[PDB]
Design a protein around this ligand. Structure first.
Ligand code: HEM
Ligand code: HEM
Ligand SMILES: C[C@H](O)[C@H](O)[C@H]1CNc2nc(N)[nH]c(=O)c2N1
Ligand SMILES: C[C@H](O)[C@H](O)[C@H]1CNc2nc(N)[nH]c(=O)c2N1
Ligand SMILES: CC(C)NC(=N)NO
Ligand SMILES: CC(C)NC(=N)NO
Ligand SMILES: [Zn+2]
Lengths: 410, 407
């Protein structure tokens, strides 16, 4: 079965065959679409088939399908599973696997960069202190003094589900949030619950508006432990506007390294519960969501006031106006400090090229439109006009339940 | 079986059961989501008629009454004898209002119960259609104080006697392919604009020429008609600060009226059912003006604002976009023509959703269409999970007549 995808802005029509290799479910049925829904221990039995599918794809990618090396590897893995219930990936398979989980992440608009990923093998790690060291090395390497490099650090895979490695932080770097007794919130409202956990665990919170949270690392299923990332390793950018000299006085700044650390990486059926990864920001993530979401820093009004916009009636579009300036400032500040960042026009244009390339060479590119289209100026970016097909391919990055909800404290 | 929908801005969670009454397919499957795709017999008829009548009588608190049963059998007999049936005026009105109520791609459904229905089922010719349409336009426009309305022409019979409004919207501007290779007017209507010429129309070769109606009655060939200029309310676009804006020579009509869809009620199909409401600012300022394939005016507005268009990161397109949209709303509001901004419209939809969930068990909604083309995440609907599914009565897309018409 072939599926056609059309771009209503250029009439370009693409054909998708890749979806035929989709196995996981989407959440949607032939009677309902859950496309806008945020989020809708294995056995030897279901493991080998998963390993085989992966290994077949791997050996096919290197043009060695059917080879003796390919057949031996399958027998080697099969024997290992029956012998230990699991199996270890070769370094080459790990790299291939991580890159493809990124390549398959339908909610990621920066996938044109997928083949450029530094993979740090932390599978020999055993303690939280070990995790800390690995993570600091990941941060310094990725930051690279502002010239960001994509990377991922992969810790030991899940075994019996009682010895999981987990990074309790949702992102390696994020600002603390504090609920005040008057009901207001200091810092990032999104991290209030995590911040409380850190404090309870022993963290001495400076209680500021931009306090870098400590790492809470869990190794081999043990109780998590706190660690402070060396300040000198956390690159930050003071936010100022190119024309509005008062912008700087808003006291705003943001970290330069976006690194998701709460997702699960699945390769050949194996589950890597601790796999922090990072790239570089698209301006709107900070300027639109982190700064202007009502449930985040929510700075629209203040910026609106300083600009002396007509805030009496929404139809003046004062929010829209302040939004553009804030995002202009974020981009400007980052480029000035020479910290990698990409605007939504560039990122979306590139994704389109990446997408078309993928249809031709791979037969498709699973993409989640709801997440791909930027949170501002939607239709003036090429992706808005691009029909997309969303389906799940493995290897992949998956969501997993927050650790504080499932962990058995020792 | 009881799906939940969460708003990530307010943590409010709503439970949806209405979807359990869905009957039509969505285009998606457990293995693939096509949520972003633009277009994913007597024996067949009665069950449909039955489904409708049941919900109708249920709505009037007469479910399982004699009146209910009586009507059910009368239609039943009528179908068996005539191979179809006619809706009572009450059913027709109820059906039209609910088709709007079920339109998952419409953000303005909070207004659903306030719909003026014009029963044009007694129509028989193209001139009769022109007359009915002019009356609709005049009623809906109401001197700038817009009123939602729909005019329903004769239902389908044997497919060879279908009524159709060839235009996509009752009021749109023409588009012509110039020698330059460029396009004059609205690029989206180039093809239609030609079928008018090819049919007789005398195009003024302008940038904003109100197109002529191409009405098709009882299956016969379509005919042209010029909408009385005095009935087509337009708004000149001027910025409330950029006096130079006017020099762009931009204007837009005040009455948005989709005319190429098919209304489905109890199995019956109304192929010609033009309907109208009032604009949400972004429709004109973002899509009609700034879409690269439309009037694509971003660069022009950018230049006159003296913005650094060298690098995309200066966000000039974004800045210009906002002004262009501030102007649209400004002009309409100045000329006292009904219009709603994306902020107010979206806030209303959220309220409507909550009403629908607590009073009906849900509200089908297509997030991809509901979220405005600009400033997405600063509107409440961005953070609102939505379940999309098809309920009848409904408004469906249908093949352009010029690809099905046997002259
Ligand atoms: C090189 C620069 C990169 C850019 C510009 C890019 C951009 C983005 C953006 C804008 C999002 C949406 C974030 C949000 O709204 O929460 C995203 C999501 C995603 N990206 Fe990328 N990305 C990059 C690198 C990476 C890397 C290196 C990986 C994996 C190795 C990756 C995996 C993903 C995943 C899995 C998601 C969804 C996360 C979630 O569900 O919360 N991205 N990316
Ligand atoms: C009262 C003011 C109304 C508002 C503010 C509203 C707004 C909108 C908007 C913004 C769209 C998207 C248009 C597009 O992007 O092409 C839309 C679509 C739609 N609306 Fe409404 N609407 C209104 C009245 C109506 C009425 C009277 C009906 C039905 C009788 C209706 C039925 C629909 C349908 C079926 C669609 C999707 C059409 C398509 O697929 O092209 N709307 N509405
Ligand atoms: C409800 C809706 O799915 C939700 O608000 C989504 C929409 N699109 C998004 N897109 C991106 N990139 N990131 C997000 O967090 C979201 N949130
Ligand atoms: C490809 C994609 O479905 C398409 O561009 C959609 C997106 N959302 C939309 N939303 C509205 N209201 N109107 C449209 O025409 C579209 N176009
Ligand atoms: C997914 C994450 C590591 N990258 C970003 N959030 N921005 O690019
Ligand atoms: C669908 C149409 C009749 N309404 C609008 N496009 N705007 O409200
Ligand atoms: Zn779907």
């Amino acid at each position: 079965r072939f599926l056609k995808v059309k771009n209503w802005e250029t009439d370009v029509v693409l054909t998708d065959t890749l979806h035929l290799k989709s196995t996981l479910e989407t959440g949607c049925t032939e009677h309902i679409c859950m496309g806008s829904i945020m989020l809708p221990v294995r056995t030897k039995d279901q493991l080998f088939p998963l390993a085989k599918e992966f290994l077949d794809q791997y050996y096919s990618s290197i043009k060695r399908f059917g080879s003796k090396a390919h057949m031996d590897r399958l027998e080697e893995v099969n024997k290992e599973i029956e012998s230990t219930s699991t199996y270890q990936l070769k370094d080459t398979e790990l790299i291939y696997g991580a890159k493809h989980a990124w390549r398959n992440a339908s909610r990621c608009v920066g996938r044109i960069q997928w083949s450029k990923l530094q993979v740090f093998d932390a599978r020999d790690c055993t303690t939280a202190h070990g995790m800390f060291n690995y993570i600091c090395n990941h941060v310094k390497y990725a930051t690279n003094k502002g010239n960001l490099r994509s990377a991922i650090t992969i810790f030991p895979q899940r075994t019996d589900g009682k010895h999981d490695f987990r990074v309790w932080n949702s992102q390696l770097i994020r600002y603390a949030g504090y609920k005040q007794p008057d009901g207001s919130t200091l810092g990032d409202p999104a991290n209030v619950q995590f911040t409380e956990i850190c404090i309870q665990q022993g963290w001495k919170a400076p209680r500021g508006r931009f306090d870098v949270l400590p790492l809470l690392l869990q190794a081999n299923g043990n109780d998590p432990e706190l660690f402070q990332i060396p300040p000198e390793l956390v690159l930050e950018v003071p936010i100022r506007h190119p024309k509005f000299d008062w912008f700087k006085d808003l006291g705003l700044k943001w970290y330069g390294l976006p690194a998701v650390s709460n997702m699960l990486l699945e390769i050949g059926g194996l589950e890597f519960s601790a796999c922090p990864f990072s790239g570089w920001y698209m301006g709107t993530e900070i300027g639109v969501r982190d700064y202007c979401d009502n449930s985040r820093y929510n700075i629209l009004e203040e910026v609106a006031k300083k600009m002396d916009l007509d805030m009496r009636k929404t139809s003046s579009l004062w929010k829209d106006q302040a939004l553009v300036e804030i995002n202009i400032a974020v981009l400007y500040s980052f480029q000035s400090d020479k910290v990698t960042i990409v605007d939504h026009h560039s990122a979306t244009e590139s994704f389109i090229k990446h997408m078309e390339n993928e249809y031709r060479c791979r037969g498709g590119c699973p993409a989640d439109w709801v997440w791909i289209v930027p949170p501002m100026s939607g239709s003036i970016t090429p992706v808005f006009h691009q029909e997309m097909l969303n389906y799940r391919l493995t290897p992949s990055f998956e969501y997993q339940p927050d650790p504080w909800n499932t962990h058995v404290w020792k």
